[model samples]
Target chain A: MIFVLDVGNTNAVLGVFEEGELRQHWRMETDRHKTEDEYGMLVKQLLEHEGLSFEDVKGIIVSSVVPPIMFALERMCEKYFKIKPLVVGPGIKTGLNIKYENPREVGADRIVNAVAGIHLYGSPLIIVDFGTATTYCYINEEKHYMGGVITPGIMISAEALYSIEITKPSSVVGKNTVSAMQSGILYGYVGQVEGIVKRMKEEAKQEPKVIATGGLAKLISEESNVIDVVDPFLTLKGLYMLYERNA
Target chain B: MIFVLDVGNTNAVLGVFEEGELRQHWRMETDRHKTEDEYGMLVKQLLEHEGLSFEDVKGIIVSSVVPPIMFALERMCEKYFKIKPLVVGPGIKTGLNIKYENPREVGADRIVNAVAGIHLYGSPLIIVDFGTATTYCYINEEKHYMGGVITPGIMISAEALYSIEITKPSSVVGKNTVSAMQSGILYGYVGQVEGIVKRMKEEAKQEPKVIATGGLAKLISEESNVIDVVDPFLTLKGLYMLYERNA
Candidate 1:
């Protein structure tokens, strides 16, 4: 069994993948200043919830956008899971070609996503990752990341008007605050996706499959015409695949 | 001379309108905790810079989206300008019919915008304000604000990636980080406007003239096809007009 952890600014999702499929999963917030024992204990709670022990874990993998939390996460892996986790950063092999001006400037999560995207979905791809920060990446057939855009994530700002749980509204033009906010956020994101995808298609000149991956991707993609696929586990599966490459 | 004050969450814009046109204007940040004296001094400095004083200001009219800032603003108006400002609220008359579930639920800035939209552009209008919080208002031929949508403003979230000044990029698919962010923020806003306006027209059978206002409206409206007019002084002009109706 392999433990995969993806740390975002808003939340962290981790799980264990046995063989070729996911087994146990859990979610938590990213407390920037939280310590190692906090994470170690939290990891144990999830492991125990699934009635599993750390003994079965062969290795642990993590890709973090939040820098401060990684210290605790790295220590937690060894102290509890008893494995030196594979951290996705420089020196790690993901077999992905980056065309960024400074390759290191590209976000670690995006790198992992590219690794997963190229392997699972193949090349000539436009990957939209909806996390604490929404990212759109354009990769050519040769798997070189040509360019991309990063906008504020759905949870980062959308549906935060009167502050409601973001869901789709019955009508596009809502009559009240709650429903109006719902319509704006839901369709606004769809529009953003559509707009970005349309622009990307125009610039790239190839009809790349638009794959969206995130907690909110399914909801946004449902309303959007451009999103070709919504695979929620792209990040986790990417972490798993990237781990195999490095390990 | 009439002093029109438009207080938004991000910044406060105030100016003296002579006869039917603007004479002098200034902009400042919205410090929620700042006092009346702070505002009084700031207002005086701007007045002094333009070689003008409060003595020429015959009356003051104000509309604010910030709550705590209003207390200071109202006080500043009386102590310095020596006039109790005409505030846009429940009792004020703008002749603007609001169809909201609770008319009071609508924002003061939106109300002022609606007043200006109706008076300046006539009825059946869609007003898009790109303030700290971007807002969309739908008004019918009867001058009734039927409905609209509110989303994170241009400055609120867009072009915030890597924290760059928002500008229109040359291409939609940028090869670099700065350009990519520029593309996303610039085109992203156009998309939101296009998307929301399309929905509003669908909801209301009659074609509503789309009017965009606020600081970033010009930049956004340039790329957007739906926005028919970009009135920069909608709030200030609205405050001026609304004050006339009440006074």
Candidate 2:
């Protein structure tokens, strides 16, 4: 079994793969104060919940955008799993051309996503990740990682913009305040997705499939005219692909 | 000359109307701790800059979204202008009918914008204010104020989301990080404005002229097809109209 951890700014996602298939996944909030022992205990319980344990996990790979939490996470992996985990960074071979001026400047998670997206979805694709910030990566037809766009993530956009649920209102013209906010957040985000994707496609000059992943991917995809696929575990799946490449 | 003060959460806009024409305008940062004397001094310098003194102003009107700043502003008028200022609240007589369940629950700034949009553009009108929060108010064809949507303003949205300049990038697809962000901020906001206004117009089932006010209104209007008129002085204009109806 292989353990894949994708640490985002908000939450950390954990997944286990048996052989080549992803079996189970668990999500935990990203906390800076959580000690290594606390993380080890949490992982113990998560694996035990699925009638599995740390011994069953043979390999571990992590992709993180936040650096501070990596220290505790690294200690947790070594202390509990008794293995030095593979962290996606400078030395990792993604087997794709990174067109960024400084490839190291790209977020580790984005690089992982690009590798996984190209591996699974093929080249000439636009991958949209909804994390602490909304990121757009446009991969060329020859499978090169071109620079992308970044905007505020969905949840942050919601907390600051609207405290209401992000769903379509019963009517576009809301009679009251609550529904008015609902319509604005839902359709407004839909507008942003469609508009950005349209422009990216226009510049790509080719029909590149748009793949969206993260917390609001499924929700946004329901209303977005541009999102071609909604894959919640794309990051975890990418982590597994990275482990396979190096191991 | 009538002095109109429109205090938003971020800035206070002051406009002077001479014989029913808005002749001069000034803006000051909204500082919570600023004393009445400080405000008095600032107003004195501003008026004196145009070779006019507080005695030249006969009447004053104020519309504020910030409650704490009002204490000092009112005192500034009494001490410097030697007159009591009319505040826009429930008792203010706006010619248009407000359909809100709790009219007072609405922000005073939104109400002022509604009055100004209706007076200037006529109904059906959708007024969009680019402030600390982006606000949209819909006035029906019958000249009735209906509830509207509120989103994060352009600056707060930029500060929290992207700390980059909001403009059209040279290319839709950027070759580097800076240009990539320029495109995202530019096209992303354009998408949001067009999307929100399109939905509002569709619900109105008629051609409602979209009027935008505040900072970035001109920049956004250049790209947005939905925004018809970019009126920077709408709020101040509304403050003047409110004083006329009440006086």
Candidate 3:
């Protein structure tokens, strides 16, 4: 069995893969203050609950957007699992052609998504991830990892509005204050996704398969016409594939 | 000459209206901590810069979303101009039939925009204001002041993404980091506007004229397909009309 981790700004996702198939997955809030021993114990408890021991894990792969969380996570893997985990950074064999001027500028998570996307769906794909930041990545038909866009996440945008006292608890055609805010924020992002995807399609100049992933992907994709499919396990799958390539 | 004020969460907009036409306007940061005397001095300097004085103003009207700033603004009017300003609130005569369950719950800025929209564009309108919050108001063809939706402003959303380290100063298909963030934030809002406008039109079952207003109105409307007009002075125009109706 192999352990895979995707560490984002807000949350960290972990998965257990057995013989090329994801067997179990879990999510927890990402805290940079957590020590290596603390994270090691948490992962141990999670694995125990799944009726598996630390010895069952033979290899581990990690992709993190939050760099500060990396040290603890790596230490947790080495001390608890007794394995030097493969970190998804420079010098890793991704097997994809990146067309960006500075390829390192592309996020590790985005590159992971592209690897999985091309492996599973094929080339000429637009991958949308609704995580801490809502991101959009474009992969051409030639399978080159082109650049992408990153916007504020839905929850964070809502939090910012509330902080300024601009929100009210009202409806679509708000009868009161709060409902009006709820409707606007909910429907506003729906418009944003559709608008960007439409333009991206035109820019891509191809009938690309639009695949969305992340915690809020289901919510936005439900209202979005451009999102063709929602694959929640995209990043993890990509991590697994990367682990295989590097191993 | 009539002085009109629109106090929002972020900025306070003041305009000098002479003979029912907006002659000059000024924008300043809204500070709740500022005293009445302090605001008075600021306004005095602004008026003097334009070859005008407090004596030139015969009446004053104010519409504020920031409640704490009202006391100082009203006091400034009374102490400096020696005139009791007409504040837009429950008792003010707006001349439009509000369909909201709680009309007072509506932001003064939204009401002011609606008043201006109906006056200039006629009924059956969708008014989009790019202010502290990106707000959408629907006015039926019958001139009824229907409700609206409000979302976080563009800059705040961008700020939130940057705070979380999600933004990269990169390009549309960013070759670098910063450009990526700029493109995403810019195009993301563009999509959001189009999406909501398209849905609002469908719901209204009529071709409502889309008018955008506020500081960033021009920037957004330039990229927006659904926005029919960008009226920067819409709120001021509305404030002027409200003063006439009440005075």
Candidate 4:
């Protein structure tokens, strides 16, 4: 058994892999202050629910951005599971070339997406993740991770509207969908997502396949013009694959 | 001569009109702390620069969202100009009935746009203002100011990116003319503007003309599908017309 973790700005995803196949996964809100023992306890309880134990886990792998939590998770793995995790970062073998101005500056999640997208979905692809920030990651036909765009994600934009105005009430619905709330939030985001995708298609070197991921990916893909596939589990799956490659 | 004022969240613009023609204009950063006397002095200097005085102005019209400055402007007119200014709000007789869920909730700027759009271009119109927030105001042929949508304006979105992400560099210039930045910022907004226009066209009972105002109106209109005209002075013009109507 192998433990694979992909930590993002908003949420941390944990994946369990048996041999080469991903078996189970869980998402936890990211916290910078959570200690090693606490994380160990949480992962232990989560694993226990599936009738699994620390003894069954032979190895661990981690990909993260939150620096404090990374060491904590490592300490948790070393103390509780007695396994050293394979972490992805600079000097780590990702089996691909990064063509960004500064490869080190790219977010770990973006690298995970690009690596997984090019490896699994093939190159010449644009992967859009609708997270706290709606992001576009492009992989050219030559299998290089090219940089893409980033904009305010849907929920963030909605929060801004609520904070800026005094009288306007924030609603889960949009301007007209469930109510004007959803319309204001969702439709505007859909417009933004589709608009970027259309332009990416024209500007990118190849006829790239556009894929969507993250929490709001479903809502955006449902209405957007360029999103071709949505895989909520892509990051976790990528983590699993990275684990397998090293192990 | 009519004095027209457009007060925004960040700045206030003062324009002098002589016999239906705009003669001079001045912009002042909106500072709520300034006293009425101070504001009066600033306007006096601006008027002198244009070779005019308070006596040259017959009446004043003000449209403001910042309540603090609104009263200050009104007092400035009363004390210095020795004449009253027409304040835009409910019961001011805009000649257009507001059909929003809360008519009073609409921003003064959106109201100004709706008035100008209806009066200059005819009714059943969509007015998109790309200011601090990109707002859509729908006016029916019946001359009703229906509800609209508001999202983060392009520059505001750019500012969010600069603040949130450590990687995003603060360069007003986008990454590419057809770059991801263009797609994310410019085209994204264009799509948003177009999407709302399309929706309004389909759902609105009246055949509406789409018009735009504000700094980004020109940038977004380049790719937007529905905007028919870009009028930077539309709000000030509307303030002038609304005052004329009341007078």
Candidate 5:
């Protein structure tokens, strides 16, 4: 069994893979201050809940956007899993050709997503990840990793409005303050996704397969016409594929 | 000359209407902590710079979304201009019938924008204000103020992404990190505007005139297909019209 960890700013996703198939997965808040022992205990309990132990895990892989949390997670993998986790960074064999001027500047999660997207759906793909920051990764027909856009995540935007005391709308044509706000936010985001995707298609001059993933993937994809596929486990699948490529 | 003050969360916009024409306008950062005397001084200076004084202003009207700033502005109007300002609230006659459950629940800015949109563009208008919060105000063909949507302003969304350390992209199809972030945020917002407008049109079942206003109106309207007209002074115009109805 192999353990794959995808650490984002808001949440950390952990998946257990058995013979190339993702068997189990868990999600926890990504806290930078949490120690290696703290994570070890948490992962231990999670694995045990699924009737598995740390001894069952043979290898561990990690892809982190939050650099500070990596130190603690790396320690946790070494101490508990007794394996030096394969971190997605420089010199990783991603297989896809990144056309970025500074290839290292692309987020590890993006690279992982692109790899999985190309592997599963083939070329000409637009990968949308609804993480702390909503990211759009483009892969051309030639399997070249084209740069993508990064926008504020839906939750973060909602939180920002909440912080400023903006309430939600009660309905689409809200008859009250709360309802009006709710309507605006819900519908506004739908527009944002469709607008970007439409423009992207125009720029690409081809109708690429749009794959959405992340915490808010299902919610947004339901309203988005451009999103062709919703793969909740795209990042995890990408992480597993990446591990195999290196091995 | 009549003074029209539109106070938002981020900025306070002041316009001097001379004989029904908006002769001069100024924008200042909104500081809730500022005193009546501080605001008085600022307005006095602004007036003087335009070769006018408090004596030139006979009537004053105020529309504020920021409740805290109202006390100071109201005091400034009475003490400096020696006039009681007509504040846009429940009692003010806007002419347009509000479909909101609680008319007072709607922001002063939104109401003011609706008033201006209807007056300027006639009925069946979608008023988009790109202020602290990008607000969408819908006025149906019957001149009834229907409920609208609200999303984070472009600047605020960009700021939120920056908080999560999402950098800009170098190009639309960015070959670098900076461009990717830039493309995502800029184009993402354009999409958001188009998406919401398209949906609103479908719901309304009519081709309403889309009028955009606020600080970022020009920036977004350039990229947005749905925004038919960019009226930077829509709120100011609304404030002026509100004052006319009461006066």
Candidate 6:
């Protein structure tokens, strides 16, 4: 069994993949300030819930953007799981050629997405991830992982709207039609998504296949012009593939 | 003669409306830190270049969101122009019913757009304005000003893209085509606009004429489904009409 963890700004997700297929997955709120033991307890409880023990896991891998939580997760794995996880970072053998201004500035999650995109769909692709940041990661015809646009994620924008005005609550679940209030929020988000991806495609000058992943990806992509796919487990699958490439 | 000032987050624009027609307009960078005299000089020089003096203006009306620059402009007008400008704020008689959470919370500029939208096109209207914040104000069938959505303006989002990664400069400039960067931006904006309008139509159960006004209004409306008309001077004209109504 292989454990893959994707730590995003809003949430941290863990998945167990065995024999080239996903076996189990779980999600938990990400606390950047939490200690290693706190995280290990949560992970252990979640694993036990699914009738599994820590010893059942043979290997572990992680792709993280939040710096503080990365160290914590790493510590949890070493102490409890007793495995030094494969961390996706600067020196990781991601076959995609990153042509960013400074390649190191690219987020680990973005690289994982790019690796998954290129390995599955081939080059000339665009990967859109909806998280704390709605990011567009692109790979050109030559398999070069070119840097793309980033904007505040839809949920983040919704949170801002609520914070800016104390009266408004973050609730899009109740209303299906465009209430003057809902239309303003949903349309605003859809526009931001379409706007960034469209610009990215024009800049790359390639007819890349656009793929979307993450929480709000489906919500926005339903109205987008170029979004072709939405795979919720894309990052985990990518991490598993990378482990396969190395192992 | 009426001096109309449109104070935006990045720029302050002055338009000379003579005999109810806009004769000339000037744009200047907005600096909240600058004193009244510094702003007065730029305004004075621009007027002089057009062979007009401060004395030529009978009155001034302003629609502003930048709170810091308000008193400065008031000082400039009182000292140099020898006139008291009609500033849009809470107490102004806009002659429109606000069915929002709090009437005072809506920006003066958005109120100006709603007033203009209702006066010019009547009720069952949707007003989309692309300013520092892209907002959609809806006036219901009974001519009540229902509050709208607010999203970061296109230029604002572009700024975020540039600031996050120093290499990415703000791009949407001229021309509207699929290959054009401006078009990509416009397309994304349009998609958002359309989605909201479509949803609004379903909720309101009424077909509303969507009128758009502001800096990027023309660019976005060209490709959007909800935007039916573009009136760049709508807010200023609305201010002018409000003055007329009160007088």
The prediction achieving the highest DockQ against the true structure is 5
Better model by lDDT: candidate 1 vs candidate 3: 3
Worst 10 residues of 2 chain B by lDDT: B156-165
Arranged by DockQ with the best first, the candidates are 5, 3, 2, 1, 4, 6
Q: How accurate locally, in lDDT, is each candidate? A: 0.82, 0.84, 0.85, 0.76, 0.84, 0.73
What CAPRI grade goes to candidate 2? Answer: medium
| Residue pairs in collision within model 6 | A184-B149
After superposing candidate 3 on the true structure, give the runs of residues whose Cα lies further than 4 Å from its correct spot. A32-35, A164-172, B32-38, B164-171
Regions of model 4 farther than 4 Å from truth: A164-178, B164-183
Candidate 5 Cα lDDT to native: 0.84
Which candidate ranks first by TM-score, i.e. highest?
Answer: 2
Candidate by candidate, in order, the iRMS in Å equals 1.6, 1.8, 1.6, 4.4, 1.4, 7.0
- After TM-score superposition, the amount by which residue A197's alpha carbon in candidate 5 deviates from its true location, in angstroms, is 1.6
Candidate 1 docks at the CAPRI level of: medium
Candidate 5 per-residue lDDT, tens place, B154-227, comes to 88988876653323333566676677777877788787788778767777856799999988788787776688
Candidates ranked, most accurate by lDDT first: 3, 2, 5, 1, 4, 6
Please give the distance, in angstroms, between residue B28's alpha carbon in candidate 1 and its true position after superposition.
3.7
Candidate 5 Cα outliers beyond 4 Å, as residue runs: A32-34, A164-171, B32-38, B164-171
Any runs in candidate 6 off by more than 4 Å, and if so which? A90-128, A135-151, A164-181, A191-211, A218-230, B97-102, B118-124, B140-146, B164-186, B201-209, B222-226
Instruction: Please write out the lDDT profile of model 3 over residues B27-110, one tens digit for every residue.
Output: 988898899999999999999999999999999999887788788888889999999999888888887788977787777778
lDDT (Cα, tens digit) per residue for candidate 1, span B31-120: 887899988898888888888888989888988777877778888989998999998887888787778775778888888888888988
| Candidate 4 C-alpha error for residue A124, in Å | 1.0
Error of 3 at B145 (Å): 1.9
Comparing 2 and 3 by lDDT, which wins?
A: 3
lDDT of 2 by residue, B1-247 (tens): 9999888777888989999889999987888989999988888888889889898899999888788988989998998888999988877888768886657677788888888888888889999888887778888888888877777677776677654457677776666777767776777778888888888888895689999998789998898678989999988888888899889
Question: What local lDDT score does residue A32 receive in model 5, on the 0 to 100 scale?
Answer: 80
Output the better candidate (4/6) by TM-score.
Answer: 4
